[PDB]
Amino acid sequence: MNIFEMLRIDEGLRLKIYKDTEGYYTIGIGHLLTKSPSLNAAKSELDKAIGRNTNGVITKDEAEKLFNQDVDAAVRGILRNAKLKPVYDSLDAVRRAALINMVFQLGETGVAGFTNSLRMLQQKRWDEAAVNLAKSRWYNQTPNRAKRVITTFRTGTWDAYK
Ligand SMILES: [Cl-]
Ligand SMILES: [Cl-]
């Protein structure tokens, strides 16, 4: 197991524009296209991302390309973030993937705000961090996914994905 497989399980794969859990236009493997309510805006953003006139449909290879770019950006956003970097550096390989997942889903800014949990993760207080991460809208809106992530942070293993 790795970050790619992990997120592919959490995000799924869809080749046609769709609405995510928040109602926003997305495509491929959880690639957010736009927060705007306009499907045209979504289609414009898609074409621009892909470099071709798509008509809201891409190929599996295209989805994967978007995916790699997106995983790369998440890691990079973590590395450049003063609140995130130190946490990520203090963690083991498994748990770093859990942090990347949260970043991919929530955004750098969103994750950077879990101050208290961040601090708990840094101290390696697993059970405590797990409890604190659960007190959040994130857990409340997407409980199954959050549970998977939180378990990964608590155990340092891939059990929740097997
Ligand atoms: Cl892009
Ligand atoms: Cl869920």
| Residue-wise DSSP of 118-141 | HHHHHHT-HHHHHHHHHSSHHHHH
Can you give the CATH number for the domain in which 103 is found? 1.10.530.40
Q: Catalytic residue positions? A: 11, 20
List the domain range (segments joined by +) for residue 51: 1-162
CB neighbour burial string for 96-134, b if at least 16 within 10 angstroms, e if fewer: bbbbbbbbbbeebeebbebeebbebbeeeebebbbebbe
Report the alpha-carbon distance of residue 56 to residue 93 in Å, rounded: 36
Ramachandran angles phi, psi of 49, nearest 5°? -70, -35
Q: How was this structure determined?
A: X-ray
Burial class of residue 23, CB neighbours in 10 A (0-12, 13-18, 19+): exposed
Burial class of residue 136, CB neighbours in 10 A (0-12, 13-18, 19+): middle
> DSSP class of residue 34?
E
Report the alpha-carbon distance of residue 161 to residue 9 in Å, rounded: 8
Report the alpha-carbon distance of residue 94 to residue 104 in Å, rounded: 16
66 CA from centroid of ligand 1 (Å): 7
Q: Scan for tokens 């130190």, then name that residue.
A: 86
Element (H, E) at 16: strand 14-19
- Resolution (Å) of this entry: 1.9
Q: How far apart, in Å, do the first and last CA atoms of the chain sit? A: 9
Residue 104, annotated ligand binder? Answer: yes
140 CA from centroid of ligand 2 (Å): 9
Structural domain total, the chain: 1
Report the alpha-carbon distance of residue 136 to residue 19 in Å, rounded: 22
Report the alpha-carbon distance of residue 89 to residue 75 in Å, rounded: 12
SS3 29: coil
The ligand that comes nearest to the alpha carbon of residue 148 is 2
Decide if 100 contacts 74 (C-beta within 8 A). yes
49 CA from centroid of ligand 1 (Å): 5
Report the alpha-carbon distance of residue 76 to residue 129 in Å, rounded: 24
The ligand that comes nearest to the alpha carbon of residue 11 is 2
